[PDB]
């Protein structure tokens, strides 16, 4: 049986990741963090919408997986499996512990109470700060309402307050849309994968000629 999330909502402990000193951590419930058209080019998906935390708390991996499934299912069924790229941008690296106190009354007889109460690994949780992005989803500007509603649906699976924020950046880049447009018209942006590479005014001129024939 899984303890309710309220028992692990807050960042009461120091980060306790899987390490040389844990070696016994269960598998995260969320294993997929990039879904939708994760191969789409940066030009294909200009609009970005973030589901952002407004609280310093811990989100369980179960909550992250449930919210990812909810948002992906909504966006896929309403707009299409390939109309968006959803990225979960928090990872459940903090291990939660449980001190298993016996049921089956008489436990006090075969129980030491709070002696040696250090718990065993119980689950995973992502430690989110105020203003930290939880979900990002890039799509076309025409898909704004569908993406915002998918994120609003996923919000119900999380403890605490989350805000839907429309990003002023182009897709998953760190450039504001006017600046990305300016750089693309200047020809200093080249598709690498689903992301891009930017031409720098540093490094070997031979490399900056081979890459980026903006000259």
Q: Which residues within the stretch 12-31 sit at the binding site for RNA (CB under 7 A)?
A: 12-24, 31
**13 lies in the site for Mg ion, by CB under 5 A:** yes
Both tokens of residue 6?
A: 């309220």
Judge contact between 187 and 175, C-beta under 8 A.
no
Closer residue to RNA (CB): 130 or 166? 130
- Residue 187's binding partner among Mg ion, K ion, another protein, none (Cβ under 5 to 8 angstroms by kind) is none
Judged by CB under 8 A, does residue 209 bind another protein? Answer: yes
Which among K ion, Mg ion, RNA, none contacts residue 62 (Cβ within 5 to 8 A by kind)? Answer: none
In the complex, least distance from residue 190 CB atom to another protein, rounded to whole angstroms = 15
The span from the CA of 46 to the CA of 138, in Å, is 7
Burial of 164 (0-12, 13-18, 19+ CB in 10 A): middle
Q: Rounded to whole angstroms, how far apart are CA atoms 187 and 161?
A: 41
Site for RNA in 195-214 (CB under 7 A): 195, 197, 199-206, 208
Angstrom CA distances, 9 to 18, 62, 108, 175, stand at: 19, 13, 29, 34
Q: Binding residue for another protein (CB under 8 A) from 5, 71, 133, 147?
A: 133
* Interacting positions 78-107 with RNA (CB under 7 A): 87, 89-91, 93, 97-102, 106
* Binding pattern for the stretch 160-199 against another protein, x by CB under 8 A and - elsewhere: -----x-xxx------x-----------------------
Q: Which of residues 68-127 bind another protein (CB under 8 A)?
A: none
Binding to another protein (CB under 8 A) within 25-64 occurs at 50, 52
Given Mg ion, another protein, RNA, none, residue 168, with its beta carbon under 5 to 8 Å by kind, binds another protein
**43 token code pair:** 């030009």
Q: What residues line the site for K ion (CB under 5 A)?
A: 155, 158
């Amino acid at each position: 049986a899984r303890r309710p999330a309220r028992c692990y909502r807050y960042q009461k402990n120091k980060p306790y990741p899987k390490s040389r000193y844990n070696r016994a951590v269960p598998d995260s419930k969320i294993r997929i963090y990039d879904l939708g058209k994760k191969k789409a080019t940066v030009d294909e998906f200009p609009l970005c919408v973030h589901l952002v935390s407004n609280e310093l708390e811990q989100l369980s991996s179960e909550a992250l997986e449930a919210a990812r499934i909810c948002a992906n299912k909504y966006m896929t069924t309403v707009s299409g499996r390939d109309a968006f790229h959803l990225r979960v941008r928090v990872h459940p690296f903090h291990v939660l512990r449980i001190n298993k106190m016996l049921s089956c009354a008489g436990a006090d007889r075969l129980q030491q109470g709070m002696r040696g109460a250090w718990g065993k690994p119980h689950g995973l949780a992502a430690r989110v700060d105020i203003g930290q992005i939880i979900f990002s989803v890039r799509t076309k500007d025409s898909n704004k309402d569908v993406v915002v509603e998918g994120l609003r649906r996923a919000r119900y699976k999380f403890p605490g307050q989350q805000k839907i924020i429309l990003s002023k950046k182009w897709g998953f880049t760190n450039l504001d849309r006017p600046e990305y447009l300016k750089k693309r018209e200047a020809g200093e942006v080249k598709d690498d994968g689903a992301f891009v590479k930017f031409l720098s005014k540093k490094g070997s001129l031979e490399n900056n000629i081979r890459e980026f024939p903006e000259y």
